[PDB]
């Protein structure tokens, strides 16, 4: 899906010059879906997770604007999905064919998050638009603000690559490990510190999002209640 979205607290002036960068070198697709390699554990994921649904951006913004400890201005960035963007289900199917087990607790967020992961750092030329998200504290509503347009964006025609992520590490045993999540069952890889926030040596000092285990929350909707 072309034009995927990412929520970033940095101003457009920073992300239109640097862009989104990889947080490490972990290419495992079993630690990125459960978020143990993104922000809640040994954060070294070799991915930049971006949502394809416009509604997930508002869910992320509402999860950061409702803790009273976060001070900043969030921006939704629209990113043209080139051949380096992969959906998470085609690769999960391949990892299952190779002999790996993704339990329902993870298949039930591969659907919820609508992830389209980028295996390489997002170029500033892929980001087309940045929409400020303003939080009316009295009303408790997040609404779109000034939609700045990048003058660096290169308008080529491309779509997200349909297929398996290359060089995917071999699966592990069925660990049944922690699935880190925040807000309204938003993956921990969508958090602020799931990408390199050290822009030009300077570190963005914002709230560290507290994560909760999602297995109880999914067992709470998948089993009635």
């Amino acid at each position: 899906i072309d034009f995927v979205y990412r929520v970033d607290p940095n101003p457009p002036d920073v992300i239109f010059r640097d862009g989104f960068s990889l947080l490490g070198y972990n290419r495992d697709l079993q630690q990125l879906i459960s978020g143990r390699s993104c922000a809640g554990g040994s954060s070294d994921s070799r991915y930049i997770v971006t949502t394809s649904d416009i509604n997930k951006t508002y869910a992320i913004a509402r999860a950061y604007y409702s803790h009273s400890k976060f001070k900043g201005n969030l921006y939704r960035y629209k990113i043209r999905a080139d051949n380096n963007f992969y959906s998470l289900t085609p690769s999960v199917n391949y990892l299952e064919s190779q002999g790996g087990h993704f339990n329902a607790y993870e298949k039930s967020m591969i659907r919820l998050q609508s992830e389209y992961v980028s295996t390489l750092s997002i170029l500033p030329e892929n980001i087309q638009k940045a929409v400020a998200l303003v939080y009316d504290s009295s009303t408790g509503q997040i609404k779109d603000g000034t939609s700045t347009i990048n003058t660096d964006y290169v308008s080529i025609s491309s779509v997200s690559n349909p297929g398996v992520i290359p060089f995917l590490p071999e699966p592990q045993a069925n660990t049944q490990q922690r699935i880190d999540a925040f807000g309204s069952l938003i993956s921990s890889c969508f958090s602020i510190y799931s990408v390199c926030q050290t822009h030009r040596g300077q570190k963005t000092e914002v709230y560290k999002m507290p994560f909760y285990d999602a297995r109880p929350v999914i067992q709470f909707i998948i089993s009635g209640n």
Partner: protein, 119 residues
Amino acid sequence: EWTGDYENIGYFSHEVISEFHVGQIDGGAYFCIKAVKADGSRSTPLIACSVSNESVWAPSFKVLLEQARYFYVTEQSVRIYYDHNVWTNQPFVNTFSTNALVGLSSCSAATDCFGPGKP
């Protein structure tokens, strides 16, 4: 009668359940949802409640709870069918709305939503 009357039951599409409340009123078990437009547009809530032991919309209380509890923890696009002027308790009318939660439909983004709709 029926959730999709379209004559008595109104329906707001592409909503997200942002606030959830549970409690008891008059020996029952009521739960209320605050529905706001996904892209911050209408700027006014859609407070809709459902009391377990009162009204003609009572036999579908539990079935409407388990699904609301699903549209709140995930905050997916939802089409809410409500019945207006169902609650008579004036304080309940004041803090909440008169609306009664009647139906919960799943919206597959886009501009279409599964369920009864006006032609």
